[PDB]
Amino acid sequence: MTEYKLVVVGAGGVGKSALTIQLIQNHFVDEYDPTIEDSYRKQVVIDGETCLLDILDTAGQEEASAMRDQYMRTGEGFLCVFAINNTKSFEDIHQYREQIKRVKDSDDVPMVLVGNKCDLAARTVESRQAQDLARSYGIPYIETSAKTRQGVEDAFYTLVREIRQH
Amino acid sequence: GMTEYKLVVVGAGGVGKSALTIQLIQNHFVDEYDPTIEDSYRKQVVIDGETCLLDILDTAGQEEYSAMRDQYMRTGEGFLCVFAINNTKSFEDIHQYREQIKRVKDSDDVPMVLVGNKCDLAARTVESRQAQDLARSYGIPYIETSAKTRQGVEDAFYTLVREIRQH
Amino acid sequence: GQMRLPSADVYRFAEPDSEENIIFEEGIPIIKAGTVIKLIERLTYHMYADPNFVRTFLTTYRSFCKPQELLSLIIERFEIPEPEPTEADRIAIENGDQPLSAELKRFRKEYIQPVQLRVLNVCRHWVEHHFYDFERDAYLLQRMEEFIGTVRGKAMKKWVESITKIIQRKKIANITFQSSPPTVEWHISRPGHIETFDLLTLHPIEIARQLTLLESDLYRAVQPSELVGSVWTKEDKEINSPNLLKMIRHTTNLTLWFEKCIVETENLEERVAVVSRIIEILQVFQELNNFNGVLEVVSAMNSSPVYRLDHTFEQIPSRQKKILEEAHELSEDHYKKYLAKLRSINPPCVPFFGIYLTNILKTEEGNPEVLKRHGKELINFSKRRKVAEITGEIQQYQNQPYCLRVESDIKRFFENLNPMGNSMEKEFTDYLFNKSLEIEPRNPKPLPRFPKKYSYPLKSPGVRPSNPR
Ligand SMILES: Nc1nc2c(ncn2[C@@H]2O[C@H](COP(=O)(O)OP(=O)(O)NP(=O)(O)O)[C@@H](O)[C@H]2O)c(=O)[nH]1
Ligand SMILES: C[C@@H](Nc1nc(Nc2ccc(F)c(Cl)c2)nc2c(C3=CCNCC3)cccc12)C1CC1
Ligand SMILES: [Mg+2]
Ligand code: NA
């Protein structure tokens, strides 16, 4: 059993915790309890191989913005999450991308761009704009809903595959 | 090559039974233990000049799974029946453990030893004479052990191996 | 340079690390032993977060620190003094200018705010995942509410207000799937006819599914509070470990029911059908990764009353003998193949709990509470980490739910199963063994014949599922 260290990052309120708890427990969290730092484990078979996912769920609130280097050092791949009804959260993605690259001193860090809350009709970030950004990073773009489970396994397990082949 | 003996520890829970195998298999002289370590219940020893391998099953903590006792007992060639010298109920349980071993092994003469274990400084309630009398009525050896000083631990296991060898 | 710290005389958590107060294992450090002050410092460390350590500590700390004392210590940790103005700040103020306060601003940003946030994360994890401390001590809860409710200042405000609401919700205290659950399967007993339910009249697929839902729920209900301190073995086990004991007593009752179904079927041909049906239920348990259920069956077949039934065993079809042998071999060699299989499957699963109990108990009993170093007694934290590795594995398999539909009548049938009746254990297991001797006497006594007891067909419907439109 290979172990994989995944880290979920992005602006406050985009659904990092809801995505993670949907993956771990098959439950949608309605409350908005801002995270400081949480960690989860999941044994799962991906492409016929059993592994153990360690998932770090990080703080999006700006008051925690000086505490990120410590978790970026440990992570092997990153889910970069924004919400498709929150343009500021999409503009915040590049700050996370640049900090991860600096901390890990690498242009080639496993990452997936995640556009969450895709169950909501009132979109303000178009898929094309997010896909363009993802291509500029060399990474896939996956739209998700922590509420309905749409795309949730695809997002996390695509990240595992990129760590596996790194 | 060397003979392997499959030994099984049985007895009441909650009264320090596990200290017997831990102290044996331990690094005698470093008080530490990881029971999850594959073959932390196997120990090569020399008994009366003959080297052998002990494989010890101690399911301490699973006493409430009472319908699994037959399964666990069936794996063994010799048995340590353990009670605590400050717990009369655990001593009174011995008769039924022995009857159950005899039924599982389908034999009236199964290698076994009676072990009285001193698990703390609380007052002893089973005197050595009572336990010697019980062991004699069964035709089996009696060994007393300390759960803290390792006294008697080697004697209990080596005596059982001698019972198997002389069966 | 490193930030300067408050004087250790006014703030105890600024004492330098030494082997008299902390020992590390041989890229964050792993603590082997330390004083409680050093453990709490590293639990809330300014340089890094350690979420695993928070879980380990909050799961195991009561073996070395009382809950009331832990709260006092983390409040002490939270109350960090700010440094005085520096010489450059002094000179600026003397000239009527605003000081740069560079050292003060850095200490706030890089020491106070991370430590305080990590103290609040301990509080949040404590309330969310270890709330029993507060259920059992109402005054502890009052102290926590008061502490959180009086934290001032904007940097912590979002989390203070959140934690206040979380506490209030915990005081007064839904699953979604990738697909639909399969259709409930029926055999001789039809829906609503609970009086006919039995081993051979319910569908074997649905017996295995409904027992798996029941056993999964029992597994998922066991909290670490029922395990740490080996409390399920002690005199107050019924008070401290009720969900664990309910889970074990279910497993015991099902094993005994299987044994009773077998030996009370006196006709040989009927008894072969009973054993074959139990092995089919075992096959579905294996398909569902219900290892508790697998071992319920394996323990029944290994029991003295059943194991000796050579005439019955001889007539078990070869392919079913192979299924049962494979399941039995999971237990061989100290569960070697079981442990490897559990770590390879795709959950949901239902682990067998007994191995966890033995490993927690032996870890507790085989390691000292303290290490003595340089005349000091240090808390042996490595021992607690080992216990929390086991409780963490347990919790990891408690997360995944089964995509199976409950059948409320079948569920109630297995919830109310009571093979022993009013008999005591020794009485009942002697009865089972004497039944075994009656139906297949010891050689050289002749094998008797017995009349049939079942009026309905014995042919199994099999264990491959059906799917109408
Ligand atoms: N409709 C909808 N709401 C969602 C979705 N994901 C999260 N939410 C909601 O958005 C809010 C914030 O979710 P949360 O998971 O706490 O966000 P977060 O990114 O972890 N916040 P923080 O960075 O502060 O820890 C909650 O009310 C949650 O129910 C989604 O996919 N759809
Ligand atoms: C796979 C299975 N093994 C064995 N099983 C059984 N019996 C048995 C098993 C299931 C039943 F449903 C009934 Cl009815 C009976 N006897 C055995 C014997 C003998 C015992 C006593 N006489 C000599 C022959 C020897 C070697 C193996 C076995 C294991 C789960 C337990
Ligand atoms: Mg969050
Ligand atoms: Na007593």
Q: Rounded to whole angstroms, how far apart are CA atoms A63 and A86?
A: 19
Task: Please give the C-alpha separations between residue C354 and each of B60, C219, C364, C399, in angstroms, as whole numbers.
Answer: 9, 11, 16, 19
Q: How was this structure determined?
A: X-ray
Resolution (A): 1.7
Phi/psi zone of residue C418: left (φ > 0), alpha (ψ -120 to 50 degrees), beta? Answer: beta
Q: Rounded to whole angstroms, how far apart are CA atoms C238 and C233?
A: 10
Residues with CB under 6 A from ligand 2: C 275, 298, 301-302, 306-310, 312-313, 324-325, 328
Q: Rounded to whole angstroms, how far apart are CA atoms C43 and C52?
A: 10
Number of domains, chain A: 1
Nearest CA-CA distance, residue A47 and chain C, Å = 11
Q: Among residues C410, C463, C435, C456, which one has the least CA distance to residue C261?
A: C435
Question: In C, which residues are within 8 Å of A28 by CB distance?
Answer: 174, 176
Nearest CA-CA distance, residue A154 and chain C, Å = 12
Domain that holds residue A165: 1-166
| Tokens standing for residue C401 | 């739910």
Count CB neighbours of B105 within 10 A. Answer: 18
Contacts 24+ apart (CB under 8 A), B119-128: B119/B15, B119/B16, B119/B19, B119/B84, B119/B86, B119/B147, B120/B16, B120/B86, B120/B147, B122/B86, B123/B86, B124/B85, B124/B86, B125/B85, B125/B86, B125/B87, B125/B88, B126/B83, B126/B85, B126/B86, B126/B87, B126/B88, B126/B91
Q: Among residues A43, B121, A47, which one has the least CA distance to residue C347?
A: A43
The answer, for B71 touching chain C at a CB cutoff of 8 Å, is yes
Which residues between 220 and 239 in chain C have a beta carbon less than 8 angstroms from any beta carbon of chain B? 230, 232-235, 237
Q: Rounded to whole angstroms, how far apart are CA atoms C394 and C392?
A: 5
The end-to-end CA distance of chain C, in Å, is 73
CATH 1.20.870.10 in chain C, residue ranges: 4-171+354-396
Q: Rounded to whole angstroms, how far apart are CA atoms A85 and A130?
A: 12
A45 and C346 within 8 Å at the Cβ level: the answer is: yes
Count CB neighbours of C314 within 10 A. Answer: 10
Looking at the CA of residue C271, tell me the nearest atom of ligand 2.
14
Please provide the CATH number assigned to the domain covering C4-171+354-396.
1.20.870.10
Task: State the CATH number of the domain containing residue B157.
Answer: 3.40.50.300
Q: Rounded to whole angstroms, how far apart are CA atoms B156 and A40?
A: 45
Count CB neighbours of C335 within 10 A. Answer: 18
Question: In A, which residues are within 8 Å of C175 by CB distance?
Answer: 26-27
Q: Among residues B95, B103, B94, B80, which one has the least CA distance to residue C303?
A: B103
> Are C199 and C277 in contact, with CB atoms under 8 Å apart?
yes
Q: Rounded to whole angstroms, how far apart are CA atoms C439 and C264?
A: 9
B105 is in an annotated binding site: no
Which of the listed CATH numbers 3.30.565.10, 2.102.10.10, 2.40.50.100, 1.10.840.10 matches domain C182-353+397-466?
A: 1.10.840.10
In sequence order, which residues have a C-beta less than 8 Å from that of residue C279 and are 6 or more positions away?
A: C297, C316, C320, C323, C324
Residue nearest to atom 16 of ligand 2 (CA): C307
Q: Going by beta carbons, is chain C in contact with chain B, meaning 3 or more pairs sit under 8 Å apart?
A: yes
Amino acid at B89: K
- Diameter of chain C measured on Cα atoms: 114
Q: Is A68 in the pocket of ligand 1 (CB under 6 A)?
A: no
Buried b (16+ CB within 10 A) or exposed e, C219-247: bbebbbbbbbbbbbbeeebeebbeebbeb
Task: Please give the C-alpha separations between residue C161 and each of C118, C120, C150, C155, C437, in angstroms, as whole numbers.
Answer: 16, 11, 10, 12, 69
At CA A155, angle to CA A150 and CA A159, rounded to 5?
Answer: 170
Cis upstream peptide for C444 (omega within 30°): yes
